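PROTEIN DATA CARD
Card holder: YTH domain-containing protein mmi1
Chain length: 134
Origin: Schizosaccharomyces pombe
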Amino acid sequence: SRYFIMLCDNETAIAHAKKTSIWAVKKDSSKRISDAYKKASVYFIFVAQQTYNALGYAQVVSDLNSTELPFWSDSSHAGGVRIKWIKTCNLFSAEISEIVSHMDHGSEARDGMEMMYDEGSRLCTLINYAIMKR
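Structure generated from the sequence above:
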């Protein structure tokens, strides 16, 4: 399993993705994600950019496609992927936020980056736990 963070700075993008199960992948992250999709189960963990709220996580279930992008995409995006939502939420967890704060080997997460297996596993557990506690 391989895990990537999507930092959402646009409420309409996440709302649309929660309804339509498509995400737009940035040109700078697309090569790594597409390659990972061919080699492993790939998960996107969605986090709000401004607050580090947990928004959910999903499995990627199609490869990068420049011909299927959601309406909110722009010239920074290479293509879309279809996703399968596993959990959806909108909550603040200080434990989740701390992981995001240090995801770039001690520096703050960057949108589209791949995280370590341990970080992905922990984040998915923390999302499940936060949901069951709220």
